[PDB]
Design a protein around this ligand. Sequence first.
Ligand SMILES: Cc1nc2ccc3ccc(CNc4ccc5c(c4)CN([C@@H](CCC(=O)O)C(=O)O)C5=O)cc3c2c(=O)[nH]1
Ligand SMILES: Cc1nc2ccc3ccc(CNc4ccc5c(c4)CN([C@@H](CCC(=O)O)C(=O)O)C5=O)cc3c2c(=O)[nH]1
Ligand SMILES: O=c1ccn([C@H]2C[C@H](O)[C@@H](COP(=O)(O)O)O2)c(=O)[nH]1
Ligand SMILES: O=c1ccn([C@H]2C[C@H](O)[C@@H](COP(=O)(O)O)O2)c(=O)[nH]1
Lengths: 264, 264
Amino acid sequence: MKQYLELMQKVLDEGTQKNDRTGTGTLSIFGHQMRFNLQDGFPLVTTKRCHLRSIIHELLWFLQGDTNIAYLHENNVTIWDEWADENGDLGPVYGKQWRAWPTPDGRHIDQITTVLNQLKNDPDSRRIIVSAWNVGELDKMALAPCHAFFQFYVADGKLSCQLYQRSCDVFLGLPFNIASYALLVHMMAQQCDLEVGDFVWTGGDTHLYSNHMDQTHLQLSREPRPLPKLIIKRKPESIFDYRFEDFEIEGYDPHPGIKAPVAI
Amino acid sequence: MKQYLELMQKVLDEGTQKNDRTGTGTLSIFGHQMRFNLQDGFPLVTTKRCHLRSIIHELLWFLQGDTNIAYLHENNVTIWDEWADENGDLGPVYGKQWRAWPTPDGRHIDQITTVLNQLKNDPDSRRIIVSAWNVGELDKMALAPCHAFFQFYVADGKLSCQLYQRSCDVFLGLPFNIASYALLVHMMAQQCDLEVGDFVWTGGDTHLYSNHMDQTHLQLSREPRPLPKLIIKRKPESIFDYRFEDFEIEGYDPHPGIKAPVAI
Ligand SMILES: Cc1nc2ccc3ccc(CNc4ccc5c(c4)CN([C@@H](CCC(=O)O)C(=O)O)C5=O)cc3c2c(=O)[nH]1
Ligand SMILES: Cc1nc2ccc3ccc(CNc4ccc5c(c4)CN([C@@H](CCC(=O)O)C(=O)O)C5=O)cc3c2c(=O)[nH]1
Ligand SMILES: O=c1ccn([C@H]2C[C@H](O)[C@@H](COP(=O)(O)O)O2)c(=O)[nH]1
Ligand SMILES: O=c1ccn([C@H]2C[C@H](O)[C@@H](COP(=O)(O)O)O2)c(=O)[nH]1
């Protein structure tokens, strides 16, 4: 994608060499924002092949409030396995914060159903936020959240979303993080009889790891193909009721996949 | 300043007319970012006179964990007055979350001590964040956090900071919020022997209120002037014991302070 290839070119031309907790070394910039008008096409990378199945299953997993990896295993998703303890638990991560943020006095707030009730009764609110950054439970999480915070806004009967991502692995994580959030914006728009607006991505530490530089220069020498189409074949009774097979992706024809190591 | 003024015209050319909680009406955009190189001077507006004594007093009030406007009265800062209960209290707002985010298990977390220790021991960290968006406590706050989430970054001996401001009053609040955080970046750079870097601002619902258009049109015809320079006259034993006496701006030659109606 134009926006994606241009962030890669910007971290290569402006990135400073940093060290990081996984030992691997990075090229790094701080502060970046880009926008995708979701009516132009579904924002899934065409310069290397990505796999929808995985983006969808992790999204369904977040929406049920799940933080154990067995659901993901049942549907062949492996990326969470190094962080999981012996019982497959990742601790209070995304799915838990989304659906059941713990308050000081006993309570639990479901941030997803709150947001659906704000878009319905009060779409002009400036407080239609979902946060995963629970400072209090961060010591209990397998990984502190990268895509930590997001805000929805409604305009001419169109739903927009902005995500604050504190840390971003440009080459490996970001194809999946933007497809994940753009999918949640078609799901919340369908539920609210709203049209799709913009998905705005903002990054804190936006980086390329040192052992991704050949890969990066190969992908960037590929010109983008036309952006694919998302078809939802079913409007479920609630947002928690989407199954994998409601979603069809049309017109997706990518360049060959490019592999690269995950820094631990 | 040119970034701030470019944003102001953008909200007029492109802003959607929205109804808001006050009734006043607004012109609005979603998703906007601004980079301020702090080497080039202090980012306090020159097109209208801003009063540094109130900026510096609100911020020392935050850093001490205080949610009662008593301190701000001793030192004449008003603005938090319609939101305070008869005992002068705002609920667990900014300062309470910066210094004492409360767990489910009784304990508290001092996010400013955490963040100073991370800057003094692990500067490459992509988790040097402090959040004021405490979901389990939003209902006990008089007004939910506008400047909600920020992240620090260390690259070539320089300290940078990025802010997420969910809802923004371009005319009134935004001049004060840019100086306030740029100021914090200077106190943190000083306590941690780092040079100052970039201050990056990211907004959600960025808006201009209807009854501000005249003052905005007056401001857009005035040219910006050179930025001031912030001298910090001493080096305190901790970031918690700074004082009004310690801050000085050389080179501030603004246009007159412009009066404009606040919305309740
Ligand atoms: C350094 C780093 N660490 C991470 C650790 C946790 C993550 C969890 C999820 C995601 C983003 N979500 C997905 C969700 C599914 C897949 C992938 C990523 C990557 N992908 C693997 C497939 C793994 C496999 O062989 O089965 C791939 O590289 O193609 C997936 O199918 C990124 C990370 C990162 C990440 O991208 N970078
Ligand atoms: C509509 C609106 N509501 C707010 C809610 C309370 C706020 C609290 C803090 C700040 C930002 N902090 C400061 C810090 C200093 C000053 C002001 C605000 C406003 N101001 C007034 C004086 C104080 C007053 O309005 O009572 C001025 O003359 O410009 C100050 O000197 C803005 C708001 C807004 C805000 O920006 N706009
Ligand atoms: O959704 C995800 C999850 C993780 N990461 C990356 C960010 C960093 O490269 C790494 C997490 O390491 P820290 O930032 O916590 O150090 O994983 C992503 O890009 N996207
Ligand atoms: O630091 C601050 C505090 C408040 N506001 C503004 C944001 C909105 O204009 C209004 C708060 O209204 P809500 O967003 O909460 O609805 O005050 C600022 O811009 N900066």
